[PDB]
């Protein structure tokens, strides 16, 4: 578990964070390993770690989505540790965020959700909020449950449940960026 200062991402994929090569070595991390991140307010996230030559050893590059889940801003401090124990997901339940689905077009699952997970390796954590690109907009979803819990990797075999009513965004679920 070492701490690093938060920096902007060069890679918007929500599933990824970046480190310097030397940092990685210090941490015995390999490119592509899944990591456990800890931020503010007991918040956590699971990500894929990448190497990045432009990254200062003392910082981590982290997308807005991740930053939000961790309740951190640029220049804040997070903890990182290896998490090879993460299992493939059996089942997950997600729900759209009310304020991000006003007059959507097309089928929620097929247009917005499915292509997030389709042909993608996605480590998820219970309570996660994630952003998708489908349909010229920016739908958000919350992970309301996982099996296993709280962490898992969304696999091709993972049953993805999305049915139900759009949720109200909680106070500490507002975007900080």
């Amino acid at each position: 578990p070492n701490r690093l200062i938060v920096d902007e991402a060069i890679n918007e994929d929500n599933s990824v964070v970046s480190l310097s090569q030397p940092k990685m070595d210090e941490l015995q991390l390999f490119r592509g390993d899944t990591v456990l991140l800890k931020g503010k307010k007991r918040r956590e996230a699971v990500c894929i770690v990448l190497s990045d030559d432009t990254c200062s050893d003392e910082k981590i590059r982290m997308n807005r989505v991740v930053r939000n889940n961790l309740r951190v801003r640029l220049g804040d401090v997070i903890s990182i540790q290896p998490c090879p124990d993460v299992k493939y997901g059996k089942r997950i339940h997600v729900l759209p965020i009310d304020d991000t689905v006003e007059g959507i077009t097309g089928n929620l699952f097929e247009v917005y959700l499915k292509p997030y997970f389709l042909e993608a390796y996605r480590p998820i954590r219970k309570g996660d909020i994630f952003l998708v690109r489908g349909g010229m907009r920016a739908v958000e979803f919350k992970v309301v449950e996982t099996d296993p819990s709280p962490y898992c990797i969304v696999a091709p075999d993972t049953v993805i449940h999305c049915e139900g009513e759009p949720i109200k965004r909680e106070d500490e679920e507002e975007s900080l960026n």
Partner: protein, 81 residues
Amino acid sequence: MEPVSKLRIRTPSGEFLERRFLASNKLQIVFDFVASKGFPWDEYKLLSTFPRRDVTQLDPNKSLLEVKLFPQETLFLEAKE
């Protein structure tokens, strides 16, 4: 002393395959390794995280360094369908 590539490979059950390779040696070596461990070319894909690539669909005749597999990378196996 020669450039070496460390690889780690997640199995579909969560175990890890570890092995060091010569950065210079052909990709085929990798394919053979995974086969050797019970995951034959025709049944399992070897995948990278980001960018997402089907390693087993890359040129076998190409070196590891050539396919940006250097110096350390974690990959994962997935059943073919």
